[PDB]
Design a protein around this ligand. Structure first.
Ligand SMILES: [Cl-]
Length: 405
C-alpha cells in the first residue's frame, strides 16, 4: 500500500499520524524543521500548560500503551502567581485554605466576602448547569492585555466580584482568573465557579514540549510509522483531482494515497534567556502587573526550572518572557532597533523587581519580534492548547479512515 503523507502540522499532525498508523494505515510523517537548545539550556515557548491530559492519554490507549511509559507529567504548584509592581503577590491554586490565608493578608473582611461570593455563585449555577477542564492561556490574556480592563467580559466579572470583595488586588486577581480559565476574553461568572466544582491541576512534561513531541514520535514509530526529517515540501504531484506524490526541495519524491496538512489584537514579543543561577523564588508561571486599580497585565514570565531542572545545566535557569506589542505594521516600528532596546528594558525591569543579579548571570538569549514571525479528493486539512490541537486531529482521522477503508 502507498503510505499516507502527514505534512508537519505540529501536535495535530503527530496525533493524526498516530491515529492513522494505529488503524492499520502506513504513514509517512514529514518534518520540515518549537523547541531550541543552546549551551545546555532548553528553550520552549510552545504552550507548556497541561490541565487536561485525557486527549493525550487517549492516543497512547490506541496502541494499548499509557502516557507515563513515554512521558512523565509533573504537577505545577501554585498554578501561577500574580505579581504587582507594588510588591503584592497572589498565588493561585484550588486549595480554599491557602486562598483564604492569602485573602486574610490583603483584607480580613474579604475571607467572609469570598465565602459569601462562592455561596451566592453556587446557588446561581446549582441547577441546569453542567464539564470541560479549565485551560490557562496566558498568551491569549496578554494579546488582549492593553484593553484587558476595557473589555465587557472584565467589567461584568469585576462588578460581580466587587459586590462581595472590597480589596482592589483581590477584585483584580479573581477577575483575571475568571477570564484566564474562561479561555475567550463571556460575561457569565460560571467559568470562575465551575473551575472549583472539579479537581484539576497544572502539569508540565519532564523535558518540556520536546519530550512530549519525542514520546509521541516514539509511539508513532512503535506503531510502524516513518518520520522524514528536513522535509521541505516543494510541490504536490497531481493526476486528475488526486495527489499522486509529494515532492521535496532536495529532489525526493514520495508516492502517496492521501495528504494531510495545516491550512495554506496586540502582537507578542518573545525573549528567551538562560542564567547561570537558578531563581528558586519564582513560580513556574508568573503574571506581572504594572501601572498603565492603576495596574494591568504587562509581562508573562515562564520559569520552568522550579518544576524541571533538566531544562538547564546544574545550578542554572532557563526562562522566557512575553511582552504585548502593537500589531506588525500598526505602529511603523523597526524591530532591528526596537527589539534589542525592549530586550534590555525587560532585563532591567525583571532584575529590579523579581530577579536580582539577572544581567550578571546571562549566558545566552534570543528574541522573537513580530518581524521574525513573518477540488483535490485525497487532500485533508488538519483541524485549547496542546490537548485541543490533538483532539481536532481525531475528527480528521475519522474522515480519512472512512475514505481509506
Ligand atoms: Cl509596527
Amino acid at each position: 500500500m502507498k503510505p499516507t503523507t502527514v505534512i508537519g502540522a505540529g501536535f495535530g499532525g503527530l496525533a493524526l499520524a498516530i491515529r492513522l498508523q494505529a488503524a492499520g494505515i502506513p504513514v509517512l510523517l514529514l518534518e520540515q524543521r518549537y523547541v531550541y537548545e543552546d549551551q545546555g539550556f532548553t528553550f520552549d515557548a510552545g504552550p507548556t500548560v497541561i490541565t487536561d491530559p485525557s486527549a493525550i492519554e487517549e492516543l497512547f490507549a490506541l496502541a494499548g500503551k499509557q502516557l507515563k511509559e513515554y512521558v512523565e507529567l509533573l504537577p505545577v504548584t501554585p498554578f501561577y502567581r500574580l505579581c504587582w509592581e507594588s510588591g503584592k503577590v497572589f498565588n493561585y491554586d484550588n486549595d480554599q485554605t491557602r486562598l483564604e490565608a492569602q485573602i486574610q493578608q490583603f483584607n480580613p473582611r474579604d475571607v467572609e466576602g469570598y465565602r459569601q461570593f462562592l455561596d451566592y455563585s453556587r446557588a446561581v449555577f446549582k441547577e441546569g448547569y453542567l464539564g470541560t477542564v479549565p485551560f490557562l492561556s496566558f498568551r491569549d490574556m496578554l494579546r488582549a492585555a492593553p484593553q484587558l480592563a476595557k473589555l465587557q467580559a472584565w467589567r461584568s466579572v469585576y462588578s460581580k466580584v466587587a459586590s462581595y470583595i472590597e480589596d482592589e488586588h483581590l477584585r483584580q486577581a479573581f477577575s483575571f482568573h475568571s477570564l484566564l480559565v474562561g479561555g475567550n476574553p463571556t460575561s457569565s461568572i460560571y467559568t470562575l465557579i465551575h473551575a472549583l466544582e472539579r479537581e484539576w491541576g497544572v502539569w508540565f512534561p519532564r523535558g518540556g514540549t520536546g519530550a512530549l513531541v519525542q514520546g509521541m514520535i516514539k509511539l508513532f514509530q512503535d506503531l510502524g510509522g516513518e518520520v522524514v526529517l528536513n522535509a521541505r515540501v516543494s510541490h504536490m504531484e497531481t493526476t486528475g483531482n488526486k495527489i499522486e506524490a509529494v515532492h521535496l526541495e532536495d529532489g525526493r519524491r514520495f508516492l502517496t494515497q492521501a495528504v494531510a496538512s495545516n491550512a495554506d489584537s496586540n502582537s507578542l514579543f518573545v525573549l528567551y534567556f538562560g542564567l547561570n543561577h537558578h531563581h528558586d523564588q519564582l513560580a513556574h508561571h508568573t503574571v506581572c502587573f504594572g501601572p498603565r486599580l492603576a495596574e494591568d497585565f504587562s509581562l508573562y514570565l515562564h520559569a520552568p526550572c522550579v518544576t524541571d531542572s533538566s531544562l538547564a545545566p546544574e545550578g542554572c535557569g532557563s526562562y522566557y518572557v512575553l511582552a504585548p506589542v502593537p500589531h506588525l505594521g500598526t505602529a511603523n516600528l523597526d524591530w532591528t532597533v526596537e527589539g534589542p532596546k525592549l530586550r534590555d528594558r525587560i532585563f532591567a525591569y525583571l532584575e529590579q523587581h523579581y530577579m536580582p543579579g539577572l544581567r550578571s548571570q546571562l549566558v545566552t538569549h534570543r528574541m522573537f519580534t513580530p518581524f521574525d514571525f513573518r477540488t483535490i479528493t485525497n487532500l485533508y486539512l488538519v483541524g485549547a492548547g496542546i490537548p485541543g490541537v490533538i483532539g481536532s486531529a481525531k475528527a480528521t482521522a475519522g474522515l480519512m479512515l472512512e475514505d481509506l477503508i
